[PDB]
Subunit: 221 residues, 3 copies
């Protein structure tokens, strides 16, 4: 079941990528960079998840689905880049703030991987550092980044706020599932966690970009 | 023999690097970035191949020359960057298209590594995904990227087209040799593969940049 | 003692990071990028050194202990330090990102040769070490040659500051390959504990010290 679920995930990522490619061909005032980011996220995630489907992206240590971290260490900084470019749509870019989010995010995913490789108190030290990174990401998202979105007009700010809540709601689920699952307290079953880390990312990756791109395109007319 | 051949490769990379450094001192309207890229490619490749010569960049799994993938994952995106900056010479840059090529290329090399670590059907799934990335790279090269080259005038477009064909011809040899060699169908002997992945990269790396830089320098006024 | 020393290091990195954050809130004409770089260096290093403190960022190889977390630290922290140095030289003028990325490329190569040298034995070790030293020399040639000339093109006051930070960085950085060669990873003249203290004290000056000196100098160029 776990293999088939991952094949399914990868096929959905492939379909998402193709949809974003088709949209890119009639861009409606949205820059090519946004479409490129939208395509890389699912294609890379699809590849990583394909490795799990093929029985490669995991080892016994509990099962570590290490391919998930290879996925997220690329896909999640690109998602924050997407979020940051949305806030900045129609205005001056702040690449300093954007790379601040990328740095926090890459650190967050790494602490997760290290936490998964750790045992006892050490595991939760790393996990806790990852959660602290996420909180700071959310502080930036609803603080200075949102203020940039507001500086770019009511219609853009409305859209940014929607995508900001969408992203934030999904992202807090990841460390919650991690803590509950085999990598953490072990209250939730492996199969339950596998389904969560199949369904969440479909919404976090393809869902997010459908909502993000459609909203930005709608600002054209 | 395999060790000595790799020492030779590294010495040629070193010579190439120094030649590009000397050219950079009298740039003839070619930007420093092009000279930097031209030097990094062979220096990094030389280092990677030196590790093979010293017996470090390979393990038994059949022999995997993993240092080749460490080489290519840096050297091949830089080569496409070089190609893209050539198309854009004299005009506005399209870094989106450039990073599209970098992303495709890094994926291509990784699928190769994963394919080399795989057995049976799984190997050829990864290989096939790598080939699909290469096809898209070539489609970009002769499609949108060439159209940018054409927007920058007759003489630049002529040069870009030459370098584009040079690169494309060499690059399709890599997945061909891979499939024929021990990593694939195993028709070719290890020594045969080692020689191909010594001679190809000399032309793909040092050869390419001699052709690319000389062509751009020839466009210089006064 | 080695664990406690690393905990101490990480706490000092954390304090440095917070100080640079507070400075960033009243920037005095210094761009946000400089403050971001100043914070990333110690935070990343603190993380890497925390792994050593917890007993994770090291393994036994050739009977010697390899502190592999130091290389994970440096491969990110040292290119960011040269970026900081390069942006100082370019302060008030056109940027040269080609020269900046030249330094980043040399630096990342340097740290990798170090790691490979640490994993190597006999002549092979010193081939890698030697390539790393050659990278450092070229970095220093850039620092006192073309990069300094960019600093001079941005006026007397900036060039004076750049030269100070350039000497500060250079003096600290030549110590790293010296300690490495003398210590367990090299000739084995110096004891593990000696090396551990060197690679605790040097980086406090190389990371937090450097940025205090760099940022204070740039801020002092502001007229309020
Ligand atoms: C094993 C893998 C190792 C990978 C190693 C990765 C190193 C990360 C750092 C790179 C240098 C950062 C470059 C900084 C670019 C300069 C920023 C700039 O242009 O500044 C503009 C201005 O200062 C703002 O207002
Ligand atoms: C694990 C894989 C890591 C790969 C990292 C990327 C390798 C290096 C290639 C980067 C491409 C650099 C292109 C620079 C564009 C310069 C454009 C300009 O001159 O304005
Ligand atoms: C592919 C592109 C990015 C995702 C890749 C990561 C998964 C790689 C996993 C390779 C493990 C193979 C080992 C084995 O066959 O046992
Ligand atoms: C460890 C690996 C980490 C690599 C992370 C990959 C993605 C990182 C950053 C993406 C930044 C995109 C910049 C967009 C520029 C906006 C524009 O000018 O259009
Ligand atoms: C963990 C490792 C992550 C490393 C991240 C590196 C970030 C460093 C530098 C970012 C520089 C951004 C400069 C942008 C200037 C232009 C602008 O602000 O719009
Ligand atoms: C989950 C908990 C953390 C999220 C907190 C978000 C706070 C945003 C601050 C808003 C502001 O800076 O004005
Ligand atoms: C939807 C169906 C409900 C399935 C159960 C929900 C998950 C609870 C946690 C667990 O079962 O480990
Ligand atoms: C599995 C299929 C993918 C599921 C993704 C969708 C998430 C929700 C997106 C809803 C917005 C689409 C319409 C719109 O915003 O214009
Ligand atoms: C510098 C360029 C990259 C070099 C290649 C990596 C070399 C391989 C290092 C592992 C060798 C360990 C051993 O001695 O067995
Ligand atoms: C590796 C990941 C590649 C995807 C990253 C983001 C794309 C960044 C492109 C920046 C575009 C700048 C403007 C332009 O010249 O098109
Ligand atoms: C590590 C980073 C790996 C990157 C992920 C690999 C997959 C990326 C592929 C994206 C390329 C598709 C974009 C092509 C469209 C460009 C065009 O419109 O001509
Ligand atoms: C569409 C583009 C895909 C092209 C890829 C071709 C893969 C080559 C087939 C692999 C050989 C299988 C032989 C075997 O299984 O023994
Ligand atoms: C998913 C990736 C799919 C799309 C990549 C297409 C690359 C560009 C094709 C354009 C062809 C042309 O204009 O000549
Ligand atoms: C972010 C900084 C990263 C530090 C690397 C730490 C890796 C530790 C792995 C665990 C080793 C072990 O427990 O045996
Ligand atoms: C592993 C070692 C190499 C990794 C880093 C490679 C860096 C070299 C690549 C590209 C150089 C980018 C130059 C950007 C030019 C912008 C214009 C300018 O201001 O000069
Ligand atoms: C001992 C360290 C070696 C290097 C010292 C730096 C030498 C700088 C000289 C170059 C300056 C110039 O180009 O004028
Ligand atoms: C001042 C330099 C300090 C270094 C001297 C300590 C050497 C101790 C040792 O050999 O272990
Ligand atoms: C580059 C991402 C490719 C993943 C999609 C291909 C796998 C689909 C599985 C369906 C059988
Ligand atoms: C799964 C995703 C496949 C493509 C989604 C298309 C949605 C179009 C909405 C209008
Ligand atoms: C067995 C004990 C489990 C410890 C869990 C600790 C994690 C709590 C959530 C993260 C808080 C970080 C700071 C905010
Ligand atoms: C001014 C910058 C100095 C760079 C010189 C090195 C570039 C040539 C390629 C490397 C050769 C290494 C040997 C030392 C010279
Ligand atoms: C075991 C040793 C592995 C090699 C270490 C060097 C890796 C260089 C970086 C590779 C990714 C670009
Ligand atoms: C020696 C241990 C094996 C190291 C393998 C390194 C993998 C490098 C892959 C680069 C991306 C294709
Ligand atoms: C067992 C020995 C077999 C030796 C075969 C060597 C094959 C070398 C082919 C290299 C092709 C390079 C093409 C470069 C074009 C310019
Ligand atoms: C080594 C590849 C071919 C070298 C000759 C190229 C000549 C370019 C024009 C000067
Ligand atoms: C180091 C501490 C930095 C905290 C960052 C908070 C997010 C920005 C708020 C404006
Ligand atoms: C731990 C490694 C990564 C560290 C990243 C540091 C990010 C600092 C965030 C600063 C945000 C300032 C916002 C100003 C408004
Ligand atoms: C132990 C192996 C994993 C850590 C590798 C660190 C490499 C640092 C130099 C790039
Ligand atoms: C086992 C004895 C070998 C001694 C070699 C040490 C010399 C290394 C090269 C030094 C390069 C300059 C710094
Ligand atoms: C004035 C030209 C540059 C001279 C640089 C002098 C050598 C610096 C040595 C750095 C190590 C301390
Ligand atoms: C640019 C800074 C380089 C500093 C390197 C450290 C120099 C240490 C002393 C030279 C090496 C002596 C070799 C002795 C080998 C005897 C066995
Ligand atoms: Na966006
Ligand atoms: Na070029
Ligand atoms: Na600086």
């Amino acid at each position: 079941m776990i293999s088939i679920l991952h094949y399914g995930y990868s096929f959905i990522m492939l379909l998402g990528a193709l949809y974003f490619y088709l949209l890119s061909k009639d861009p409606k005032g949205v820059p090519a960079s946004e479409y490129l980011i939208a395509m890389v996220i699912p294609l890379w995630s699809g590849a990583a998840y394909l490795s799990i489907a093929l029985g490669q992206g995991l080892f016994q240590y509990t099962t570590i689905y290490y391919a998930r971290y290879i996925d997220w260490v690329i896909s999640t900084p690109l998602l924050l880049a997407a979020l940051a470019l949305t806030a900045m749509f129609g205005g001056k870019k702040n690449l300093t703030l954007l790379f601040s989010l990328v740095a926090l995010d890459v650190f967050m995913i790494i602490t997760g991987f290290v936490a998964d490789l750790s045992i006892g108190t050490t595991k939760y030290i790393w996990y806790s550092l990852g959660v602290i990174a996420l909180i700071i990401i959310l502080v930036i998202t609803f603080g200075p980044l949102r203020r940039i979105a507001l500086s770019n007009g009511t219609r853009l700010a409305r859209h940014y706020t929607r995508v900001a809540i969408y992203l934030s709601a999904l992202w807090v689920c990841y460390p919650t599932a991690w803590l509950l699952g085999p990598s953490g307290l072990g209250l939730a079953q492996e199969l339950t966690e596998v389904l969560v880390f199949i369904i969440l990312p479909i919404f976090s990756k393809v869902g997010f970009s459908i909502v993000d791109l459609h909203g930005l395109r709608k600002l054209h007319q």
